[PDB]
Design a protein around this nucleic acid. Structure first.
Ligand SMILES: [Mg+2]
Ligand SMILES: [Mg+2]
Ligand SMILES: [Mg+2]
Ligand SMILES: [Mg+2]
Ligand SMILES: [Mg+2]
Ligand SMILES: [Mg+2]
Ligand SMILES: [Mg+2]
Ligand SMILES: [Mg+2]
Ligand SMILES: [Mg+2]
Ligand SMILES: [Mg+2]
Ligand SMILES: [Mg+2]
Lengths: 50, 75, 136, 177, 116
RNA sequence: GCCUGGCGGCCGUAGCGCGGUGGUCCCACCUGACCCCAUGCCGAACUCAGAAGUGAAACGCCGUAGCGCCGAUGGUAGUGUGGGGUCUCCCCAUGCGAGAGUAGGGAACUGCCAGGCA
RNA sequence: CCUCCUAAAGAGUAACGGAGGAGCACGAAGGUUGGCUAAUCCUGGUCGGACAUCAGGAGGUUAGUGCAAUGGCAUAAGCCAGCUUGACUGCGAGCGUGACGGCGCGAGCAGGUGCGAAAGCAGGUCAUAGUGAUCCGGUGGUUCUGAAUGGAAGGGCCAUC
RNA sequence: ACUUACCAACCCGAUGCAAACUGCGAAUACCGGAGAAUGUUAUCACGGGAGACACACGGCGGGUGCUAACGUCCGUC
């Protein structure tokens, strides 16, 4: 509905991304979460929120 | 204004008393903990009770609330 | 004309009217009117029997009504086809079983009471019978 | 301070004997004193309450507890979450020390002191009086004011009846009309 | 409600140690004394216990009910436990925080060779 | 053997309530709070250091059927099968048989470990 | 599509039958550790009204659950705070539910993480609605394929629109 | 503030009603296990060929309708 689809992008240069959703009007900052990257096989900071 | 219904969920007991179940076997499909999980019974996210061990389904009432519990007794 | 002040739901299933009654003894008065038969008592019927009771007895004694028409009955109006939803509530009935005390009375002698109920009973669609209070 | 020891030394003796008790721990002993300010008007501006919180914190040693409304009551346009009050709970020393700072230093400063009630005793042995202007207590300066908000005090006890509840405060020089 | 409050505060961990079938080293604490039992998975039989309300270890304490008394009980019950052959237990704080006297008792049993 | 405490079984014939009762010990309140830790204020609670005081509160035990709870027998209702009728409801044969209620019971019982008086 | 009833005590079960909802929300309203326990009325108390806040008492969930209803919920699934990203990736014994497509539940394993002293819990939210097959394309990744050969185009595969 | 022929909840005692009420609760039916007799494997699985997917009345239990209809929609025989 309101909430919009985003991709969380790995900082490990792998190209691996997660996908999730965000409300942009509220919490307009960049969602940064530590997530498992399965190319280097470590937990890694992911960054994007569109 | 009164012509809608939901598809039926096929809940309830799937394995009755003394019935020999393998591990993983769903025992009850339920909305909430109408039955609680006992020995060798797991309670899943939808609150369905499933067997963790091969064995025999055992219904029992236990505790100060007289709650209904399900356990697997290894045969 | 008796009717529930409020109800949880507007329309009730037809249901069935099996079994013997509860409320089988005279409980508040000395005398009562007991049903022998089975069937619905509409609110208009209950008011008419009550009107005839209170006039056969003129400001004398006390009267109790033990039945309440709580069941809504529906009717499709004239020239409507079958279906297209359930009909609209037209009247309220009390389901009656054999044995149900329907009205009770004290403060008058028996003989006036036998006469009051006879007139009330003529208004009702169910066989009735006069009855008296019982000890233990 | 003193009224802890003067309780132990003196007030206990009076109550121990005039209630013909059989064990020392029966004697009603003050547990806590709660100073409360139903703020009310402050739902418009947050600042009205914080002026009242600092008001509470000058009277007593310790800092107060900005309450909430627990529920929604449209009769005064409030809701679950918006602050509608503030309070303090005084125990141990500050409790007693407050009790001297009130009975001997603020209780002597009423507009037409006609005495004090003995029916605001709660029916289970706890007294509460509530006053009408903040300045009566010493640490609120008469010139640093912005609005006149009273408060509510409640002396809670280990008592049972309002009878011995009176006996305790009556044996503390507490005013009773 | 201070009594009941602790028992309700202990239930989830206790009930969870039943389902895991793990012998749990229970701890009871009072302003005076401190206690410890190694209780079997049925919950209905002690294997090993130690406490400051004794004489075998209470003469060696300034005051029963301190972090050093706890250590004694903690070091005691682990030694008694390792004689009977009991090594892997689960700690049951029984609604007391894992902060001082209980942490002392549990930290000592660890050094004495109880696996938790 | 009796008292206390911890852990359980059992989950109200086990609970509430009322009246009485206990402090060697244990338990409770209790004393104090630099430090450990803590209060969205408060050493109230959590918590640590303690042991003057009390068994008042609590707790436990004992007692008392005001209540809750348990609860027959018998009958009643319903019902499977078969049969039948005056068939919107009933009856018969057989089998199963409640709920409510009545008499009545009932102030739990039991285990493991520990400690204390004897 | 979800909930209840109809529905005849397993499931399932129809009507232009009776009644209500959904087409979301949430980086916390999720995970974990630790802690707490309501509604309502009563008594008494400054502005206080019948109802704000405070204290006690009775009460015992008659509340609360991000949103319908149902079943659940105190070991709380309900309220609070601290730390955090398990709203992990690959798999998956075995069950369930479906004509099929499919949907659902899932211990346990590998890898890596968070919480916690530890046992352990965590593969989203108390659960059950919150959705759209295939085709055609788009984007990123992946030297799998590459119409003489080396490349490339396009295609495939993985992730997503 | 005094009263009031009107009204009056909560609580208590008594009297009933409920598809969407349940502090109780069957008979039946269903799942499973064991055992005997009994039955032309009556069971399941894979495969070859199908037809059929307008049903009807009766009994029982029900919705709907008027417990109207050789009416209508389910369940079961
Ligand atoms: Mg069903
Ligand atoms: Mg059935
Ligand atoms: Mg893992
Ligand atoms: Mg939900
Ligand atoms: Mg490509
Ligand atoms: Mg070419
Ligand atoms: Mg080429
Ligand atoms: Mg067709
Ligand atoms: Mg057809
Ligand atoms: Mg048909
Ligand atoms: Mg026909």
């Amino acid at each position: 509905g309101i909430r919009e689809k985003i991709k969380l992008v790995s900082s490990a240069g792998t190209g691996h991304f997660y996908t999730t959703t965000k409300n942009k009007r509220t919490k307009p900052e960049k969602l940064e979460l530590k997530k498992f990257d399965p190319v280097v096989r470590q937990h890694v900071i992911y960054k994007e929120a569109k | 204004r009164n012509g809608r219904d939901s598809e039926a969920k096929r809940l309830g007991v799937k394995r009755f008393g003394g019935e020999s179940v393998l591990a993983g076997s769903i025992i009850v499909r339920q909305r909430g903990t109408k039955f609680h999980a006992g020995a060798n019974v797991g309670c899943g996210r939808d609150h369905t009770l499933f067997a963790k061990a091969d064995g025999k389904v055992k219904f029992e009432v236990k505790g100060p609330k007289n709650r209904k519990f399900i356990s697997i007794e290894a045969e | 004309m008796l009717q529930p002040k409020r109800t949880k739901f507007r329309k009730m299933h037809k249901g069935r009217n099996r079994g013997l009654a509860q409320g089988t003894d005279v409980s508040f008065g000395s005398f009562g009117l007991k049903a022998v038969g089975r069937g619905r008592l509409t609110a208009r019927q209950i008011e008419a029997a009550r009107r005839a009771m209170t006039r056969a007895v003129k400001r004398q004694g006390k009267i109790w009504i033990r039945v309440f028409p709580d069941k809504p009955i529906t009717e499709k109006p004239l020239a409507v086809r079958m279906g297209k939803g359930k009909g609209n509530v037209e009247y309220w009935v009390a389901l009656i079983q054999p044995g149900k005390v329907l009205y009770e009375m004290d403060g008058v002698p028996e003989e006036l009471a036998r006469e009051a109920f006879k007139l009330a009973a003529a208004k009702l669609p169910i066989k009735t019978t006069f009855v008296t209070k019982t000890v233990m | 301070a003193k009224l802890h020891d003067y309780y132990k030394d003196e007030v206990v003796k009076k109550l121990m004997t005039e209630f013909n008790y059989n064990s020392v721990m029966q004697v009603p002993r003050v547990e806590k004193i709660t100073l409360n300010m139903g703020v009310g008007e402050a739902i418009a501006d947050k600042k009205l309450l914080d002026n009242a919180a600092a008001d509470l914190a000058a009277i007593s040693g310790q800092k107060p507890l900005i309450t909430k409304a627990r529920k929604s009551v449209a009769g005064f346009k409030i809701r679950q979450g918006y602050p509608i009050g503030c309070k303090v709970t005084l125990r141990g020393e500050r409790m007693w020390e407050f009790f001297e700072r009130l009975i001997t230093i603020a209780v002597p400063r009423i507009r037409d002191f006609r005495g004090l009630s003995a029916k605001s005793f709660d029916g289970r042995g706890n007294y509460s009086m509530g006053v009408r202007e903040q300045i009566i207590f010493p640490e609120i300066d008469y010139d640093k004011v912005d609005r006149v908000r009273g408060l509510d005090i409640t002396i809670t006890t280990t008592a049972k009846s309002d009878e011995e509840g009176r006996a305790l405060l009556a044996a503390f020089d507490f005013p009773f009309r | 409600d201070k009594k009941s409050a602790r028992i309700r505060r202990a239930t989830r961990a206790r009930r969870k140690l039943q389902e895991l079938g793990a012998t749990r080293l229970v701890v009871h604490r009072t302003p005076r004394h401190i206690y410890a039992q190694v209780i079997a998975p049925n919950g209905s039989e002690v294997l090993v216990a130690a406490s400051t309300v004794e004489k075998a270890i209470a003469e060696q304490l300034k005051y029963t009910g301190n972090k050093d008394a706890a250590a004694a009980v903690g070091k005691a019950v682990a030694e008694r436990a390792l004689e009977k052959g009991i090594k892997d237990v689960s700690f049951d704080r029984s609604g007391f925080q894992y902060h001082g006297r209980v942490q002392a008792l549990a930290d000592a049993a660890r050094e004495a060779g109880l696996q938790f």
